[PDB]
Design a binder for these strands. Structure first.
Lengths: 394, 107, 60
RNA sequence: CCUGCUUCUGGGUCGGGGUUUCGUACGUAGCAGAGCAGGCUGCGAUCUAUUGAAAGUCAGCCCUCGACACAAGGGUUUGU
RNA sequence: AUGUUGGAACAAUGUAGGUAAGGGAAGUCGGCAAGCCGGAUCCGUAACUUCGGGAUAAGGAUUGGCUCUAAGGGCUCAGCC
RNA sequence: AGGUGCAGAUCUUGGUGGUAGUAGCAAAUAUUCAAACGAGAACUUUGAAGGCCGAAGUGGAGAAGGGUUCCAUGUGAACA
């Protein structure tokens, strides 16, 4: 017979293969398309999740109940050290799809990027790119490099760039940088190729790629949760207490003449560690890293127009399970996919952003830098000192 | 050189965080044998009975968080075995663990 | 060695259970060849096997 | 699956601060203490000061480069 | 010496225990299960009745520690136990 | 001349497979260190520590029933 009372199915089938991700770094499945009118620019960046905190800002949306009112928003902290460009790649375009044409690397590659080409750095002799770097000090080598560059002028349609993150500036335990192809969108192929040739072995800060109050896309891997049942993974109804063979299950799975159990039925398996792509994330603030001028360093990353306090975004005792943020960072509205120390892919939007929400500028009023290692109640260390006063240990 | 005796303090609390009540003390002796093979890498580890009394002094559930250990490597005597060196582990009663480094004591 | 016979014999002579019976762990070879209550009594005088004191149940 | 395993540098252990949880430790002194028994002394729950004190604090928190050893390793395969 | 073995892990489903913000049976054939009350002292206790009961009906208050006071006894009026 | 020919009868007897080195060795809080012995020690013996039975016991003796299971020595062929 038919089902007595209709109800929508549990779980979307668009994220059906709930397996462990074959990759750990987020992958850009579709880069933004390019038009020759725009200048050359980067379209993707790679960051690392630090933590989350509050924010205070003024809302300037017309016609609302919350217009000209102070709100709080959950914001993510993604520490984003600048990249080092180590190579470029060209793509000829085929009737069978998109095919890579030629990959050209730098003359000398930093050892942070050399970590990626080895499964075991301790036992290896670090012999990668040793004969490839001999091509840059012979006259036949330079003519071959220019012939390879001239070949990409003619045949390549899409040009990406190979850039890697900088583990030396991050407080993470690992030292192995993550390589990433970033599509360069801009003018014609020729000036696109010349711009990436100049940018070789150069620092690429975040401000070149992204800006404030801009829709971006976050790509990353879900927090791992291991093997889980249908009640946790698929959020099915719990069976009553009187069930004999258990109650955290799926009661009726399939019909009889459907002699095979279907692919659309909720079954137990791996939950979490799934590759995801979240869109329409708002950048409230692109921060600045620690920098030293006139002897002392500058750390007023949490300073706003009204706070004017020299505190940083690092809370009291630092970020929980991450470390301290010393490099420049981006502040994204709402929670993002992935756990602490998770590599995160930042990407420009694939859609034309013309809305009241996506074009609203943000003016920060107060950034909460209280301790997240419990119920914190102090913004800065010296504010607590002025309240607590002297202690026994003084 | 090879006969080296030195003081050590072990944070038992951080090596027991997670196990059940009926195995806290039986586990607690394991990271003392495991600790002894780390600095002086001798598989033959003998722990003194007074150390076993100190760990079991609060029963099987409550274990002292910090404990002071004289961890000494000595020559293996007759009934010859491939481990030509062994490590003797001795309990050291110390009232407080504030400002205790690893003291390299002498003979 | 193996000393369940001596502990059983030391239980009967001293008129108490084997809980309170203490054998010397260093003179094990001397205790092991007793095999009789007469030589068990000699080990009592020699101090090798000693009755353990009664556990306190203080009324204070 | 994701990391590290000597550029006198790396991590590990301990320790020190930061953060945080609970709530003011033992001992001492008090003419504070319902009072009680022989110039004061003995008992007295509790209170006060030492005392936001004492205790815990990554095992999956944060900075040390304070002290200590350890670290150029062991074994098995892979050819156009 | 832990009931005819151990060690390492702490995934789902289990079996046995618990805790849950707001609602309080809307769940279910059905308050199934779970949960509330609970000892003692002082008040108070209905309809009905075969006057024996109902009845610990129902419904209220108190409970710790310390320091004192009073009362309840034997041996020759006071002393001593 | 016959007790003369099997593929079956949920046939009889006997032997061997897949399952499968799988289900399982999860009712009653708990074991740890050192020494002895031994070729071999998580399980044997001794000492110490931490626990349980908590006198309606996991204690000390009986009746029925069992019948050498009681004691000493030795063994680790078969069982535990």
């Amino acid at each position: 017979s038919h089902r007595k009372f209709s109800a929508p199915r549990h779980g979307s089938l668009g994220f059906l293969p709930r397996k462990r991700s074959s990759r750990h770094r987020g992958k850009v499945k579709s880069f933004p398309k390019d038009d020759p009118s725009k200048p050359v620019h980067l379209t993707a960046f790679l960051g690392y999740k630090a933590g989350m905190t509050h924010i205070v800002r003024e809302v300037d949306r017309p016609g609302s109940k919350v217009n000209k009112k102070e709100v709080v928003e959950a914001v993510t902290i993604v520490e984003t050290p600048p990249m080092v460009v180590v190579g470029i790649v060209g793509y000829v375009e085929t009737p069978r799809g998109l095919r890579t044409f030629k990959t050209v690397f730098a003359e000398h590659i930093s050892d942070e990027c050399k970590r990626r080409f080895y499964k075991n750095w301790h036992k290896s002799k670090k012999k990668a790119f040793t004969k490839y770097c001999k091509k840059w000090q012979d006259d036949a080598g330079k003519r071959q490099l220019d012939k390879d560059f001239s070949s990409m002028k003619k045949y390549c349609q899409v040009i990406r760039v190979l850039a890697h993150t900088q583990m030396r500036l991050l407080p993470l335990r690992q030292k192995k940088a993550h390589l990433m192809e970033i599509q360069v969108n801009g003018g014609t192929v020729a000036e696109k190729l010349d711009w990436a040739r100049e940018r070789l072995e150069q620092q690429v800060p975040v401000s070149q790629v992204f800006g404030q109050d801009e829709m971006i896309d976050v790509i990353g891997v879900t927090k791992g949760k291991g093997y889980k049942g249908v009640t946790s993974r698929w959020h099915t109804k719990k069976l009553p207490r009187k069930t004999h063979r258990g109650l955290r299950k799926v009661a009726c799975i399939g019909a009889w003449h459907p002699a095979r159990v279907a692919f659309s039925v909720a079954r137990a398996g791996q939950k979490g560690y799934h590759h995801r792509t979240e869109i329409n994330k708002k950048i409230y603030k692109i921060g600045q890293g620690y920098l030293i001028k006139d002897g002392k360093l500058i750390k007023n990353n949490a300073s706003t127009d009204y706070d004017l306090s020299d505190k940083s975004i690092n809370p009291l005792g630092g970020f929980v399970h991450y470390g301290e943020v010393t490099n420049d960072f981006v502040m994204l509205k709402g929670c993002v996919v992935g756990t602490k120390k998770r590599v995160l892919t930042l990407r420009k939007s694939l859609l034309v952003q013309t809305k009241r929400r996506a074009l609203e500028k943000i003016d920060l009023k107060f950034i909460d830098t209280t301790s997240k290692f419990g119920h914190g109640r102090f913004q800065t260390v010296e504010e607590k000192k002025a309240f607590m006063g002297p202690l026994k240990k003084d | 050189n090879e006969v080296v005796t030195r003081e050590y303090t072990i944070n038992i609390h951080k090596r027991i965080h997670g196990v059940g009540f009926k195995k806290r003390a039986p586990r607690a002796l394991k990271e003392i044998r495991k600790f002894a093979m780390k600095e002086m890498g001798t598989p033959d580890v003998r722990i003194d009975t007074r150390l076993n009394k100190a760990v079991w002094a609060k029963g099987i559930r409550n274990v002292p968080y910090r404990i002071r250990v004289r961890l000494s490597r000595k020559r293996n005597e007759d009934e010859d075995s491939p481990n030509k060196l062994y490590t003797l582990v001795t309990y050291v009663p110390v009232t407080t663990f504030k400002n205790l480094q690893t003291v390299n004591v002498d003979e | 060695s193996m000393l369940r016979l001596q502990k059983r014999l030391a239980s009967s002579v001293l008129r108490c259970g084997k809980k309170k019976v203490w054998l010397d762990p260093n003179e094990t070879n001397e205790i092991a060849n007793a095999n009789s209550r007469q030589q068990i009594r000699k080990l009592i005088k020699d101090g090798l096997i000693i009755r353990k004191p009664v556990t306190v149940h203080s009324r204070a």
